[PDB]
Homo-oligomer: 211 residues x 5
Amino acid sequence: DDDKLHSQANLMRLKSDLFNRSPMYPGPTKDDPLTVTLGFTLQDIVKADSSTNEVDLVYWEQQRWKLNSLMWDPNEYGNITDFRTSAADIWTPDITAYSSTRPVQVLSPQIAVVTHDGSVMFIPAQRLSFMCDPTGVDSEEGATCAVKFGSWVYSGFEIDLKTDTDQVDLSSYYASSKYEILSATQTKHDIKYNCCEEIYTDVNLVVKFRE
Amino acid sequence: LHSQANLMRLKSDLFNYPGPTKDDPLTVTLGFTLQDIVKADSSTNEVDLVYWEQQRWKLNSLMWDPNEYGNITDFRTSAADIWTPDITAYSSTRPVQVLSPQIAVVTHDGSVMFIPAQRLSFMCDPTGVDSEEGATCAVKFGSWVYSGFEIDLKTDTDQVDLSSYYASSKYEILSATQTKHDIKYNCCEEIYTDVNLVVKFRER
Amino acid sequence: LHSQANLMRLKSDLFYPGPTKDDPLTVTLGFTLQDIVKADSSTNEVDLVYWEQQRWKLNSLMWDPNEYGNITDFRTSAADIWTPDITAYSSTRPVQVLSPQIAVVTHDGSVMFIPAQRLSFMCDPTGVDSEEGATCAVKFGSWVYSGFEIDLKTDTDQVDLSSYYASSKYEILSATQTKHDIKYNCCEEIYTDVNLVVKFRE
Amino acid sequence: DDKLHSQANLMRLKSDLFNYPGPTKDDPLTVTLGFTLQDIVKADSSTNEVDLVYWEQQRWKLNSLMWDPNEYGNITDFRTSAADIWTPDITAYSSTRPVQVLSPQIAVVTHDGSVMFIPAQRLSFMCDPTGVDSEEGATCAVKFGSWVYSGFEIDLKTDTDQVDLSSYYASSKYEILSATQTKHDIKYNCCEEIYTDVNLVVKFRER
Amino acid sequence: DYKDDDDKLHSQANLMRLKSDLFNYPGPTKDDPLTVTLGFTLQDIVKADSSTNEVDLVYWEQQRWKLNSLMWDPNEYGNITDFRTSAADIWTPDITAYSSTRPVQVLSPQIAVVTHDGSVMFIPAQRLSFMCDPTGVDSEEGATCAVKFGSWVYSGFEIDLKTDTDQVDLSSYYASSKYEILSATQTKHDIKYNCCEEIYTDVNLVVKFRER
Ligand SMILES: CN(C)CCOc1cncc(N2C[C@@H]3CNC[C@@H](C3)C2)c1
Ligand SMILES: CN(C)CCOc1cncc(N2C[C@@H]3CNC[C@@H](C3)C2)c1
Ligand SMILES: CN(C)CCOc1cncc(N2C[C@@H]3CNC[C@@H](C3)C2)c1
Ligand SMILES: CN(C)CCOc1cncc(N2C[C@@H]3CNC[C@@H](C3)C2)c1
């Protein structure tokens, strides 16, 4: 009862200390670059449209980064080791699919988890329409498509993009989807664009699937 | 007149809680009323439900003595002015659509009641819907970022309220249940909790 | 010049927490049915375009026009005053607003708010291709206020059909609007709704 | 250098001017309304909806927005987000979907106090397209007026009764045989007051 | 490494200082016009609908301009040469498509990059339905359609519109699209409208395309 509110007080003090008694992280820079880790969990291939060459994917995008300005010692705060916060209240990376054909639709609350070492985990579930030719989807070899994800405005010198893991997480894939996944990989690459001198980094998701 | 000033004073006293923690966990009670299965799509394996999701919780920081506030026992408030649980369907295929105003009722004991009516599109293979046994589909609900140690889910009953179900729907309900379940991953040490909505239905 | 200053003065002087059991509010509801746009026998949704007239009066919005350059009415954004949370109880999509979200406040404290809306709602259209046509119902009322806080009334039980689109695919045989009180399982308090009953055919 | 002084004159103007609550019976307003019909996208005979893209030209004048260009570096016009000023609540009276806005919600103010706001919009409205595959084509109408202001607070006029057809898409699926816009005054059953609208009448057929 | 740590601390401090300095330009005028450079990269023709004569495109729209009020010396700010800002925090040109049939849908974060010389780069990826007759698309010479982009409320005497090439960039065009691009050009034009006396300027995007 009284312990309960002391617990609420500790968490309010921690959020107020982090968000008001110190400047908020303004984003990475060439001199203070930020490593962002990216992982994908494929939940469902909803639809493959061979008349427009678009395919609709439900998936979770795991994003992790780590910030000194979000560190704290649990001993000073009632041994709290995590807290949740609205993703809008903090800096988040601008990860963007580079071949979507519709705005991404958000299916989960936009809430980040901050742990006392300053690491942030943000995992939005989304529905994504992207460019994909499903020719071959009704064959044993299936069809193969790809879509890559990376910052839109930060170079590879500002956001250092990495995959958490080599393997796409298929463990939550909808068993009764119209489409089975034959394989999926996620791979970092560097690339230059015509507009710009600076090098950019993306993670390429390649998926082989079939009916 | 005096009534109105008491209600305003009460809101100011309350409004001028940071979420549940492991040391101060919150019990949120969930209940579903199923109003309609609008549509079942066998080309994409998506089914569309209209339901009311009853949510209830209780916070010491929302309690007040009615005697000190004109004997006021409830008030209405925008869901955006108070903390609310992040209950999410775990297998929707479209953003859930809200069909009712985003207003909660707070009662003097600190209990909150919030009942959004929603249209949900979710992952469901409707094969067998045109047979006697129908099709069977399932969708889990629970917090997106809180574990069973911060947000404790429960139901008052395993029976989905079917008393309001649209009598001329394309699809009739054969059974609909809502079961709390506690799960442990070996990845992680904490308990996790969801309410599994299982619907058996077939064409009328 | 002097009137603009009066109007600005009036609004600043006026600028209510919503109704309560001690201070209940009567809200008057009426419907003008514009069009039955579409009937979908594959999902049993039907789409209506209608006007929803809402009316209520508040002492805290009363003024004497002679104290304010003889102003008798003004316009305000519906977001700047309390409005009733009238909800369609059997929609299948979020209702789509078709008109500006503005109310008119009159010096006696009455407020008039008339949103034009497009609604999809649960409705089986079998029979629509016959002489007797199909019948469907949709009820409207506060979502969170009991009949002890919002007292729902109509001026008439007949839906205004005088604006009904003469070249709609569907003709209105009849349309009624009726107040009723409802108990729900969740809640001890009684709720009040207006039930819209419409018989229509191709 | 002089360009920095010009930016300061603009900021001074916007600041001064922004230090009007809408029209009333004692201070009414006449809004000029015209339509630039761009395209009939779609006629649906299974619901009797038709989809237009058009430009809706709105023009009004307020003394409180007048200024002398001599005082402000000869600036004659500035731009402002349409949310930061009063704009009329012109509404189609028989749309079946929310109007979709296609152009930026920015208005233009001129030193004589005139305001021009011209949203490009896509509208679905109640229209029976029967006859559109014949030589006579189909005729449909949809009227535009204030929702909440009577003729004595907002009046309308048109500069012409002919709709501007000079931007009409020449490869549309539908060709326009005529398009008029005509002011009327009307009463409704809810309300004592007289409302004003401009009725847009369009005769069209398949190309 | 203690040095390495507060090197990072001072970098963040320099970035916030620079942003505070710059934020603590009201648009162009006839006396102080602004030149905007406009260029398109075409990513995909998604869909051509011959029943409504609408076609859907995914492209990048590159907008560039330069302001003296956005200049700074890096030496005074820890050698910072760029920063990111929400496009809502700065003035941006109201470049609009003139024949869209649906609200244009943005696909990229609404963020601009500002560089120490005062130039701003803003590149929204967009999906667009515009008026287009796809007759011919099932033929060797394909179909030809055009959509023009430019300010909606600023005349050519306020926003001076310019390309820095006539060729639409096709190096990112989706190679497995339903449609192949035969050619794509971007060309500035001036024009007068019935409403208004002032002259307006835009960039016309002409695309010739056919079924793959
Ligand atoms: C030159 N400079 C330092 C300003 C960089 O400003 C930009 C602002 N917005 C988008 C981009 N890009 C657009 C494509 C998609 N994102 C990766 C590439 C190519 C960069 C660049
Ligand atoms: C019990 N109490 C004093 C607080 C009531 O809290 C509520 C909050 N939100 C919605 C409802 N309702 C949902 C259904 C639709 N509306 C009419 C009924 C049934 C009430 C009730
Ligand atoms: C009496 N009085 C001063 C209150 C008028 O307040 C109103 C508020 N909202 C809408 C309307 N109307 C809606 C329909 C469409 N517009 C013209 C008619 C019919 C009026 C009137
Ligand atoms: C005359 N004057 C100084 C006020 C001009 O104010 C305007 C405000 N909003 C839009 C426009 N236009 C709309 C069409 C699209 N853009 C090019 C033309 C035609 C201008 C003009």
